[PDB]
Amino acid sequence: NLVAEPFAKLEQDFGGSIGVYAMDTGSGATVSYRAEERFPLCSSFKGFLAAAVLARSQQQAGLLDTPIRYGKNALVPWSPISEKYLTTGMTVAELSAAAVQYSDNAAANLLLKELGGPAGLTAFMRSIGDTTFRLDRWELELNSAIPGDARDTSSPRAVTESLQKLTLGSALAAPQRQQFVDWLKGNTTGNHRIRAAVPADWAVGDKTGTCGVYGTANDYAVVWPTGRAPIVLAVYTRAPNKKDDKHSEAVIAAAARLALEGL
Ligand SMILES: *C(=O)N1C[C@H](NOS(=O)(=O)O)CC[C@H]1C(N)=O
């Protein structure tokens, strides 16, 4: 219908699959396209990982400033922050900021270990009412993005609903929610994705993912307009099925534009 056609055309031009869910928290209006289909999370799970850390900080005093000593064996490719602190270590909060804002892989594994692994993060997501999210593997294996594999996936609607609960709703206490918002607002990896769709004088917090298959990538965000209620949205892609020419970032930005225009 009228709502789906601009997304279907964008998806047809892209050649893969796109999933979009957006909610206007002022009016309750939504935009939905393949919003209940599963897509690989890849690095985007790191936002929810940081939220799970903050949930634990409601119960364990001093957790955030607790140093985690790690060695070279914890490092994996794309660990730009943790590679600089081998001899000094990093605190839980510093690891969380690195995982969110630089998508640091070693930091994400260290925090997963603190939380009881992929099963522990999945249990946290269940505890906030997310029945779709599943994390099954660690970095780097979780990025495999095998078509039809449900491991390490969620849906755009579940991502958006969980993000809303954690940044604007009641799933975290206010100081924790503000810290999550601040980490998302300072993300450095999303400048070509949802942020490319928003007016400059708005504000955005986001977390990206870029899977091991070109064309499978994603971004979710809270967007704060001027003078009206925030919008929460998620845009996920799956690569065309049966070398950097998939323009996945442009597709994510274009889908975000349609959502913000149509809302
Ligand atoms: C996350 O999906 N990853 C971490 C890193 N940065 O990508 S992101 O900025 O889009 O999050 C490299 C790609 C990927 C990975 N393979 O771990």
Side-chain angles (χ1 to χ4, degrees), residues 1-2 4-68 70-263:
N1 61 5
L2 287 168
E5 194 221 89
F7 294 108
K9 174 171 132 36
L10 177 62
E11 180 179 69
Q12 180 153 105
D13 295 342
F14 166 57
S17 303
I18 86 176
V20 178
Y21 192 77
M23 60 197 339
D24 177 343
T25 67
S27 63
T30 62
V31 172
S32 189
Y33 186 83
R34 301 191 191 281
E36 283 86 26
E37 298 193 16
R38 283 172 174 299
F39 294 78
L41 290 160
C42 300
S43 284
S44 77
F45 89 92
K46 295 166 184 161
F48 294 119
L49 177 64
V53 167
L54 289 167
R56 186 161 290 181
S57 83
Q58 291 189 193
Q59 307 199 37
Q60 189 178 330
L63 172 65
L64 298 172
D65 287 338
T66 291
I68 300 203
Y70 56 91
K72 288 190 163 203
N73 58 352
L75 296 180
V76 297
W78 199 284
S79 298
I81 313 301
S82 50
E83 183 268 342
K84 316 166 55 103
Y85 301 103
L86 276 178
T87 64
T88 166
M90 298 180 67
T91 63
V92 169
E94 289 162 353
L95 289 166
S96 297
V100 173
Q101 299 183 334
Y102 295 90
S103 218
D104 192 292
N105 276 331
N109 274 353
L110 289 165
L111 293 171
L112 273 176
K113 170 191 206 144
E114 274 263 347
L115 300 167
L121 180 56
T122 299
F124 169 69
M125 287 314 271
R126 292 295 178 278
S127 81
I128 68 168
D130 195 319
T131 58
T132 307
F133 177 102
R134 53 184 290 181
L135 201 73
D136 297 88
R137 292 171 294 170
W138 304 73
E139 296 287 357
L140 304 172
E141 290 88 0
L142 60 83
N143 299 291
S144 55
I146 299 155
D149 188 2
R151 290 181 296 178
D152 311 297
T153 62
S154 195
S155 69
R157 179 177 74 151
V159 166
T160 294
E161 281 164 353
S162 289
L163 186 61
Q164 184 276 338
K165 291 171 181 170
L166 293 162
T167 57
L168 303 172
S170 284
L172 291 171
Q176 279 79 12
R177 174 171 75 170
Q178 186 63 62
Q179 179 66 82
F180 189 34
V181 162
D182 284 357
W183 283 334
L184 293 166
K185 280 182 168 192
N187 178 36
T188 72
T189 66
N191 287 341
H192 299 299
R193 296 179 192 191
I194 292 167
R195 288 181 196 269
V198 304
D201 216 12
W202 292 12
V204 179
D206 84 293
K207 179 77 195 81
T208 55
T210 309
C211 296
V213 176
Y214 275 126
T216 300
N218 57 57
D219 190 34
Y220 57 71
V222 181
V223 172
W224 286 269
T226 49
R228 58 187 176 99
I231 295 153
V232 190
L233 77 163
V235 183
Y236 281 69
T237 76
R238 299 190 302 260
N241 219 3
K242 277 307 209 64
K243 15 115 208 99
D244 59 300
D245 53 9
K246 309 292 164 190
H247 344 87
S248 78
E249 307 200 284
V251 171
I252 289 163
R257 281 189 199 96
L258 290 171
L260 298 175
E261 298 149 350
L263 255 191

